[PDB]
């Protein structure tokens, strides 16, 4: 294991016909993770061969969308804010990598 | 999404050669989950065709181990009460169910 860093990346999606952005959008101040409690926007999921197909993964953290932050909103207005963009939404996350535990024992 | 629950579910592992028990055990007090802090003693994985195949699973925690209790043990603690069994350990875990949102919305 290692202790959690997060990655931040910042990328431009078009819509595509059909598919929309293609991400599903989860969390919110007032749409807790039932696990962890945790109150992030989410993208819980990618829909395969969309527009965030290899630009963005399942449990990214959503930080801003078109310069708007998402610091502790609401599931709606994370998702009125994507739903209102035009061809394009800029949108940066935060990445998780790492986790596990220090010491791991086989018996 | 739905609301945690955890079953439990007490199984008896006989060793094989070169295999042991063939599980993996992580947690403990002194050895908390780097992303989530919890404690718990925690199957972290199974061995492929390994006595605890289709018994026990990835992320399964453990209560008991042949009577003793897991409760906020320390890791080696844990270690040593599965590595001193003989032929049998009795183990019972909690396996959880569930998780995600309350609302999730594609865009």
Redesign the interface.
Known sequence: ????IWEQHTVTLHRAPGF?????????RD??????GETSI?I??V?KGGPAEGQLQENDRVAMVNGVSMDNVE?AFA?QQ??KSGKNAKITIRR?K??????????
Not at 98 to 107: A, H, I, L, N
């Open positions: 294991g290692s202790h959690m929309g952005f293609g991400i599903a959008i989860s969390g919110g749409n807790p993770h039932f696990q962890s989410v819980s999921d829909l599931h998702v994507l739903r998780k790492g986790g596990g535990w220090r010491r791991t024992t086989w018996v």
